[PDB]
Design an enzyme around this catalytic site. Structure first.
Site, short mmCIF file in Angstrom:
data_model
loop_
_atom_site.label_atom_id
_atom_site.label_comp_id
_atom_site.label_asym_id
_atom_site.label_seq_id
_atom_site.Cartn_x
_atom_site.Cartn_y
_atom_site.Cartn_z
N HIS A 1 0.81 -1.21 0.00
CA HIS A 1 0.00 0.00 0.00
C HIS A 1 0.85 1.26 0.00
CE1 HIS A 1 -2.88 3.01 0.70
NE2 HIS A 1 -2.87 2.99 2.02
N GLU B 1 8.59 5.63 -2.42
CA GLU B 1 9.32 4.89 -3.43
C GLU B 1 10.05 3.71 -2.79
OE1 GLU B 1 12.67 8.50 -3.61
OE2 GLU B 1 11.03 8.25 -5.05
N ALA C 1 -7.33 -7.92 2.26
CA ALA C 1 -8.54 -8.11 1.48
C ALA C 1 -8.47 -7.31 0.19
CB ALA C 1 -9.78 -7.71 2.29
N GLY D 1 -9.60 -4.51 -2.53
CA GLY D 1 -10.05 -3.14 -2.43
C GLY D 1 -9.83 -2.39 -3.73
N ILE D 2 -9.98 -1.07 -3.66
CA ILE D 2 -9.82 -0.23 -4.85
C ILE D 2 -8.41 -0.36 -5.43
CG2 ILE D 2 -9.75 2.15 -5.64
CD1 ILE D 2 -12.18 2.02 -3.11
#
Lengths: 126, 126
Positions: B9, B45, B71, B73-74
């Site tokens: 993420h 980065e 999970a 997601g977008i």
């Protein structure tokens, strides 16, 4: 007795909700905790305060809160501590319906070798 | 050959990138993939296209992209797929310095029983 409260992030998309539900169902299948509840960080209910309220509602004195998060972040290091009322010098204290219930806030998953195992399973399409 | 690209993420706070660093070190320790790199979707980065740049730089023909996400997601269902230029079937068609490079995009971790194991380990402070 002792309850387990699992805690996950909110998404607006429903995938994370199902993730937390199924995880709670499998830990229920292991039958080591009498009460197991779930809590979502944002957007979706239950909210985490609801998880704790219901964990005590069924009769818990010690609520184990587990961050179902891969790594630490703002949610696990700031949001959740403040939502549950944890702070300095003491770990956790909730005083409800003439009952003193203690909270213990656990750690995220981290770079566990079992995550590596799952990663490699996925890499091979498994 | 084939490379493994781990994908995370990414956060303004640093926990997620170091998580990915450690996970990539452990899978390198596992000596199943010739090239292993990581990519952060936001803020930090190295990035996902940069991860692919270096995966090909060391010599990949097949790019295994694994979402290191609990999970869906977008990011995993929309953002990251478009960053890679895939849309559903097979996923991979990439052309650089005289090279036809394939990407295969894997699935999230999900409600694996090993996440359950880790959850309970954490619950007891393990």
């Amino acid at each position: 007795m002792e309850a387990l409260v699992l805690v996950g992030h909110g998404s607006r998309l429903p995938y994370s909700k199902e993730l937390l539900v199924k995880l709670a169902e499998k830990v229920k299948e292991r039958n080591l905790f009498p009460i197991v509840e779930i809590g979502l960080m944002e957007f979706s209910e239950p909210t985490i305060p609801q998880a704790v309220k219901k964990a005590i509602e069924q009769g818990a004195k010690r609520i184990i809160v587990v961050p179902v998060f891969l790594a630490h972040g703002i949610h696990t290091t700031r949001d959740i501590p403040r939502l549950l009322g944890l702070d300095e010098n003491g770990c956790g204290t909730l005083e409800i319906d003439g009952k003193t219930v203690e909270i213990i806030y656990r750690e995220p998953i981290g770079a566990d070798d079992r995550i590596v195992d799952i990663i490699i399973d996925r890499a091979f399409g498994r």
